[PDB]
Design an enzyme around this catalytic site. Sequence first.
Site, mmCIF file in Angstrom:
data_model
loop_
_atom_site.group_PDB
_atom_site.id
_atom_site.type_symbol
_atom_site.label_atom_id
_atom_site.label_comp_id
_atom_site.label_asym_id
_atom_site.label_seq_id
_atom_site.Cartn_x
_atom_site.Cartn_y
_atom_site.Cartn_z
ATOM 1 N N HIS A 40 0.765 -1.230 0.000
ATOM 2 C CA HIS A 40 0.000 0.000 0.000
ATOM 3 C C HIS A 40 0.805 1.294 0.000
ATOM 4 O O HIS A 40 0.230 2.351 -0.320
ATOM 5 C CB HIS A 40 -0.898 -0.007 1.259
ATOM 6 C CG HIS A 40 -2.036 -0.992 1.181
ATOM 7 N ND1 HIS A 40 -3.163 -0.680 0.449
ATOM 8 C CD2 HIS A 40 -2.267 -2.198 1.727
ATOM 9 C CE1 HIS A 40 -4.040 -1.658 0.540
ATOM 10 N NE2 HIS A 40 -3.520 -2.595 1.313
ATOM 11 N N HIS A 58 -4.705 9.549 7.777
ATOM 12 C CA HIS A 58 -3.332 9.157 7.556
ATOM 13 C C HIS A 58 -2.321 10.284 7.581
ATOM 14 O O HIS A 58 -1.166 10.050 7.228
ATOM 15 C CB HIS A 58 -3.193 8.390 6.194
ATOM 16 C CG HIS A 58 -4.151 7.223 6.167
ATOM 17 N ND1 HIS A 58 -5.344 7.203 5.508
ATOM 18 C CD2 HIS A 58 -4.038 6.028 6.803
ATOM 19 C CE1 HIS A 58 -5.946 6.048 5.720
ATOM 20 N NE2 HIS A 58 -5.182 5.316 6.507
ATOM 21 N N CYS A 71 -4.549 1.051 14.214
ATOM 22 C CA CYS A 71 -5.973 1.177 13.976
ATOM 23 C C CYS A 71 -6.577 0.030 13.163
ATOM 24 O O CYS A 71 -7.782 -0.237 13.313
ATOM 25 C CB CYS A 71 -6.258 2.480 13.168
ATOM 26 S SG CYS A 71 -5.681 3.956 14.083
ATOM 27 N N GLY A 171 4.792 25.935 25.832
ATOM 28 C CA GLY A 171 6.238 26.052 25.908
ATOM 29 C C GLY A 171 6.932 25.341 27.052
ATOM 30 O O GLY A 171 6.333 24.678 27.901
ATOM 31 N N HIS A 365 -7.561 22.707 33.655
ATOM 32 C CA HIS A 365 -7.208 23.797 32.725
ATOM 33 C C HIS A 365 -8.452 24.621 32.433
ATOM 34 O O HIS A 365 -9.522 24.030 32.205
ATOM 35 C CB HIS A 365 -6.686 23.170 31.427
ATOM 36 C CG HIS A 365 -5.959 24.129 30.514
ATOM 37 N ND1 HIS A 365 -6.548 25.139 29.818
ATOM 38 C CD2 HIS A 365 -4.637 24.138 30.214
ATOM 39 C CE1 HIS A 365 -5.610 25.772 29.101
ATOM 40 N NE2 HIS A 365 -4.441 25.187 29.310
ATOM 41 N N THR A 377 -4.412 26.416 24.165
ATOM 42 C CA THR A 377 -3.316 26.844 25.019
ATOM 43 C C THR A 377 -3.454 28.200 25.696
ATOM 44 O O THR A 377 -3.937 29.208 25.146
ATOM 45 C CB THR A 377 -1.982 26.794 24.214
ATOM 46 O OG1 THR A 377 -0.882 27.238 25.025
ATOM 47 C CG2 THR A 377 -2.008 27.689 22.977
ATOM 48 N N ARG A 381 -3.790 33.526 25.281
ATOM 49 C CA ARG A 381 -3.971 34.654 26.200
ATOM 50 C C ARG A 381 -2.668 35.400 26.460
ATOM 51 O O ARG A 381 -2.560 36.641 26.534
ATOM 52 C CB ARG A 381 -4.556 34.130 27.528
ATOM 53 C CG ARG A 381 -6.042 33.735 27.487
ATOM 54 C CD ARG A 381 -6.461 33.019 28.765
ATOM 55 N NE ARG A 381 -6.181 31.575 28.795
ATOM 56 C CZ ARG A 381 -5.783 30.890 29.863
ATOM 57 N NH1 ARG A 381 -5.524 31.490 31.030
ATOM 58 N NH2 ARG A 381 -5.633 29.559 29.784
ATOM 59 N N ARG A 402 -3.142 29.872 40.002
ATOM 60 C CA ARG A 402 -3.941 28.970 40.841
ATOM 61 C C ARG A 402 -5.206 28.539 40.114
ATOM 62 O O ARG A 402 -5.082 28.278 38.904
ATOM 63 C CB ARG A 402 -4.200 29.587 42.214
ATOM 64 C CG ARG A 402 -2.892 29.946 42.924
ATOM 65 C CD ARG A 402 -3.010 29.616 44.414
ATOM 66 N NE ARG A 402 -3.341 30.784 45.200
ATOM 67 C CZ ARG A 402 -3.897 30.792 46.412
ATOM 68 N NH1 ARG A 402 -4.248 29.693 47.062
ATOM 69 N NH2 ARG A 402 -4.123 31.968 46.979
ATOM 70 N N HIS A 505 -3.774 18.010 34.775
ATOM 71 C CA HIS A 505 -2.467 17.604 35.327
ATOM 72 C C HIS A 505 -2.605 17.161 36.784
ATOM 73 O O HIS A 505 -3.356 17.818 37.534
ATOM 74 C CB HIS A 505 -1.463 18.780 35.264
ATOM 75 C CG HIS A 505 -0.028 18.459 35.589
ATOM 76 N ND1 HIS A 505 0.922 18.145 34.624
ATOM 77 C CD2 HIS A 505 0.619 18.380 36.775
ATOM 78 C CE1 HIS A 505 2.079 17.899 35.207
ATOM 79 N NE2 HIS A 505 1.949 18.059 36.518
ATOM 80 N N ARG A 544 0.293 24.554 39.851
ATOM 81 C CA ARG A 544 1.351 24.537 38.839
ATOM 82 C C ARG A 544 1.446 25.849 38.076
ATOM 83 O O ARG A 544 0.539 26.689 38.102
ATOM 84 C CB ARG A 544 1.084 23.360 37.900
ATOM 85 C CG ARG A 544 -0.331 23.303 37.322
ATOM 86 C CD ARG A 544 -0.366 23.538 35.810
ATOM 87 N NE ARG A 544 -0.780 24.894 35.514
ATOM 88 C CZ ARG A 544 -0.915 25.535 34.388
ATOM 89 N NH1 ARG A 544 -0.684 24.957 33.219
ATOM 90 N NH2 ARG A 544 -1.336 26.810 34.455
#
EC number: 1.3.2.4
Length: 568
Positions: A40, A58, A71, A171, A365, A377, A381, A402, A505, A544
Site C-alpha cells: 500500500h 493518515h 488502527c 512552551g 485547565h 493553550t 492569552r 492557581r 495535570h 502549577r
Amino acid sequence: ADNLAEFHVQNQECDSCHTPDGELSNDSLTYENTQCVSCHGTLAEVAETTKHEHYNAHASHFPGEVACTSCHSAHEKSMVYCDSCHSFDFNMPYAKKWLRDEPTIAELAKDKSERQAALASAPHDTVDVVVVGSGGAGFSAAISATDSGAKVILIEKEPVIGGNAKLAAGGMNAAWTDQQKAKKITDSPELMFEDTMKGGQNINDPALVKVLSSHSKDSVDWMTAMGADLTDVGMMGGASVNRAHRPTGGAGVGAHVVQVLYDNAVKRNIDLRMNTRGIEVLKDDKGTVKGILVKGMYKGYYWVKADAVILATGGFAKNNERVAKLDPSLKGFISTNQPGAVGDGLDVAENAGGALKDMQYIFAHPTLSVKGGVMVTEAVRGNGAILVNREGKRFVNEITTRDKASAAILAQTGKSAYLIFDDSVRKSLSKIDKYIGLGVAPTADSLVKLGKMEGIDGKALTETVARYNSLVSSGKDTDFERPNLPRALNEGNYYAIEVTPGVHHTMGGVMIDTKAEVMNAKKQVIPGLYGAGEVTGGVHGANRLGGNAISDIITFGRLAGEEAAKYS
Ligand SMILES: Cc1cc2nc3c(=O)[nH]c(=O)nc-3n(C[C@H](O)[C@H](O)[C@H](O)COP(=O)(O)OP(=O)(O)OC[C@H]3O[C@@H](n4cnc5c(N)ncnc54)[C@H](O)[C@@H]3O)c2cc1C
Ligand code: HEM
Ligand code: HEM
Ligand code: HEM
Ligand code: HEM
Ligand SMILES: O=C(O)/C=C/C(=O)O
Ligand code: NA
C-alpha cells in the site's frame, strides 16, 4: 467479508503478511506492518488517497512512525485511535466504536497461573536498565542512559508513542538562555526558582525546585544539540519575564520535542517495544531491584532481568473516578489527556514499596474548546487575547494563577466564556491557525457581526474592546490588574473561541529525591528504582505554573538515566 484478513485471503496466501514460521515477529508487529507498507505504500502515500479539506486519518499531528496496526487489526474489527478525542466523519473498513477497557493492575491478579509460569522461566532478555513509558521523561532517560554506556529497553503500553507530551503547546520554561538573550530578555535561575515556589503556595520541595531551575538552561542546550528549535520565547501566567520556549513563529513545543527524541533514539538503535505494559517490579532477597514483569499484547507475559527500573508513566488526569475521590468538585468533567493516562504507573510504584505525596492537588485547565473538546493553550492569552462573557464584558485577569480562571469562567452565564482576539494576535502565534483549521474559531470583520453569530451582546463587546485597547496604550489594567498587555486588538478581522474547564495535570505522585531515586514512607531509598516526570510528586506543590511540566520531564528524565547508568 467480516474482517480484514478474511478480505485479503480471498486472493492472497497467509505468508503475504506473516513470517515463514507464522509466529508474530514481536509486540510492535514490526514484520507484519512492513508487509502492509510493501503493498500500500507508507503512511504519507496512503494519505494522498484519503484527503478531506481540513482533516485526514493518515496525516496527523502525531510524531514518529505510526504503525498501520494501531488502527487496523486483521482477525477482528478495530477502533480508530483519533476517536478518543475527536468525532470526525470517517468510514474505516471493519471499524467498531471507540471504547477503552483496560484492567487495573489489581484486576490483573486474576492471571496468577500465567504470571507464575512466566516468573519460573528464564528471563527473556538481560540488560542494564528498563525505562517504562514513551513520553518526554522516558525518551530522555533512555537516551541519557545509552549515551553513558548502558544497554536499555524502553517499553510503551499504547500503540503509539509520546503520551501527553506530544500534545504540549505553550512552551518549556528555562532561565538565563542564549535564546532569551537574542530576544533582549533578562532573567535568571534564581528568579525562575522564586516564581515557581510562590506559584505552588510554598508547598513544593525546595530541593527539587533548585534542580528544576539550575538545570533548565542545560536542558534547553541538550535538546537544541540533538536538533530542536526552541528559539521563540513567550509569556504565561506566574512568570516575571518571558521564559516559555518553543519553535520559531509560535508552533507547539510538544510534537516537535517528541519527534526529535524519537529520531535520536532510532539513530542510537535503542530497543523500543510498543503494546507492552509494565506490571510488577521484581526484587531480590535483599530488597533491591532485579528486573520487571511485563505483559505484551500479542506475545503474553514475560520478564526482563536488569539492575535498574525507571518509571516514567505520566499522570492520572483521564481517570475521573480516581480524581473525584480526591477532589469531589471535579466529578463528571471532561479531560484534556490521552486515553491511557490513568495512573497504573503509580500502582506499580506503590506495590514496589514507594510512598505517594500531594495527591489531592489536581489542576483543571480553564480553557478547553466547547465545540472541539480539546485544550486551547494559555499562550493564546499570553500573546494578547482577552476573555468575555455572554454580556460582552471582561470579568477576570486572563493570565491569573492557581484556580482563579476556571472558577471565574464557571460563574458566568451558561458556565462558559469566549476568547476574543484579532489578526495581530493570530499572526504572532502559529498554533492559532490549528484552532481555525479545526473549525472552532468563527470570524467576522466587526465585533457587532461576531456577537450576532455567537450570542454575545455585540454593542457591549465593541465598547469592551475599545476600553481594553485604551488600557494597553496607557500601560495599566485598572479593571482587573492583568500584568502584561502586549498588543491592542485592532488589526484585520476578529475571532471568538467558546471555552470551559477540563481535568489536565496531577501534581502529586511518587516520592523522589534529588537523584530521582524513589523512597518509601520512612524516606529510605529503594535501591535500583527511579521515577521521573508527572508520575512524581513534590516539584509543583499545591498549584502549577504553565511551562514548568515540560521543563521537569526533560531535566528529571535525563538525570534519572545518568544516575541509573552509574548505579548499574
Ligand atoms: C494537551 C496538553 C498540553 C500540555 N501543554 C503543556 C505545555 O505547553 N507546557 C508544559 O509545561 N506542560 C504542558 N502539559 C503537561 C505536560 O505535557 C505533561 O505533564 C507531560 O506529558 C508529562 O510527561 P511524562 O513523560 O511524565 O508523561 P507522558 O508524556 O504522559 O508519557 C507517559 C507514557 O507512559 C505510558 N505508560 C503509562 N503506564 C504504563 C505502563 N504501566 N507500562 C507502559 N507504559 C505506560 C503512557 O501510555 C504514556 O505514553 C500539557 C499537557 C496536555 C495534556
Ligand atoms: C495488516 C496489513 C494490511 C493492511 C492494514 C491493509 C489495508 C487495507 C485496507 C483497509 C483495504 C480495504 C478493504 C476493503 O475495501 O474492505 C485493503 C485492500 C487491499 N489490500 Fe491491503 N492491507 C494490508 C496488507 C496487504 C498486503 C500484504 C497486500 C498485498 C499482497 C495488500 C493488498 C491489498 C489489495 C490489492 C487491496 C484491494 C484494493 C487495491 O487494489 O489496493 N494488503 N488493504
Ligand atoms: C489464512 C491465513 C492466515 C492465518 C492462518 C493466520 C494466522 C494468524 C494467527 C494464528 C495469529 C495469532 C498469533 C498469536 O496469537 O500469537 C495471527 C495474527 C495476526 N495476523 Fe494472521 N493469519 C492469516 C492471514 C493474515 C493476513 C492476510 C493478514 C494481513 C492482512 C494477517 C495479519 C495478522 C496480524 C496483523 C496479526 C496480529 C493480530 C491481529 O491484528 O489480528 N494475517 N494470524
Ligand atoms: C501505512 C499505514 C496504513 C495503511 C497502509 C492503511 C490502509 C488503509 C486503506 C487501504 C484504507 C482505505 C482507503 C480507500 O481506498 O478509500 C484506509 C482507510 C482508513 N484508515 Fe488506514 N491505513 C494505515 C494506517 C492507519 C492509521 C494509523 C489509522 C488511524 C490513525 C488509520 C485509519 C483509517 C481510517 C479512519 C480510514 C478511513 C478514512 C476516511 O473515511 O477518510 N489508518 N487505510
Ligand atoms: C491520528 C489521530 C488524529 C488525527 C488525524 C487528528 C486530527 C486533528 C486535526 C485535523 C486537528 C486540527 C489542526 C490540524 O490540522 O492539525 C487536530 C487538533 C488537535 N488534536 Fe487531534 N487528531 C488525532 C488524534 C488526537 C488525539 C488522540 C488527541 C488528544 C489526546 C488530539 C488532540 C488534539 C488537540 C489538543 C488539538 C488542537 C490543536 C493543537 O494542539 O495542535 N488529537 N487534530
Ligand atoms: O499550553 C498550555 O496552556 C498548557 C501549559 C501547561 O500545562 O504547562
Ligand atoms: Na505529579
